[PDB]
Design a protein around this nucleic acid. Structure first.
Ligand SMILES: [Mg+2]
Ligand SMILES: [Mg+2]
Length: 64
RNA sequence: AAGUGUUUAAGGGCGCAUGGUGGAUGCCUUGGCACUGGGAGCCGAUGAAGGACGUAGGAGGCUGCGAUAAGCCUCGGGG
C-alpha cells in the first residue's frame, strides 16, 4: 500500500493512526464483500499487508 | 391291372461372408524394484510427528495456507 521508505521514516503516532484506520478498513471491506456488494480480493490482501507489516514494525522498534 | 420313381424343412448340423458382446494380444509411460557416488542423518514446551475445522467471486476433492487463512514483508536472480 505504502512504501517502506516512508513507513520506516514515519513515527509512532502515525503508525498507530494507520493501524487503527487499517483495522477499520479491514472491518469495512471484509463486510461489504460479506454482504455481497464487493467483488475483488486484492483489497483485503493489501490491508492484510499493512496490518502485518505495522505489527512487525511495532514489535521491531519495541525490542530495538 | 400292375409295380417302378425325385418332389416339402417346423427345425437341426456343417462350412462360407458379414456382424454383435469380451478386452488378451502389439506398441507406450507421469509409475515400482535393485544398486553407485555424495549430503543430511534427527524433529519438539520459543509447543513436534499426524489430524479436525476453516480459508478461493463461484457447489465439492487434491495441494498451499491459517480469522493476517491458494498467503505477507525485507533482500537479491527473471521478464
Ligand atoms: Mg486441504
Ligand atoms: Mg533479487
Amino acid at each position: 500500500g505504502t512504501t517502506p521508505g516512508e513507513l520506516r521514516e514515519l513515527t509512532d503516532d502515525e503508525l498507530k493512526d494507520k493501524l487503527r484506520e487499517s483495522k477499520e478498513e479491514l472491518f469495512n471491506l471484509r463486510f461489504q464483500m460479506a454482504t455481497g456488494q464487493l467483488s475483488n480480493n486484492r483489497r483485503l490482501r493489501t490491508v492484510r499487508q499493512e496490518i502485518a507489516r505495522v505489527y512487525t514494525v511495532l514489535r521491531e522498534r519495541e525490542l530495538g
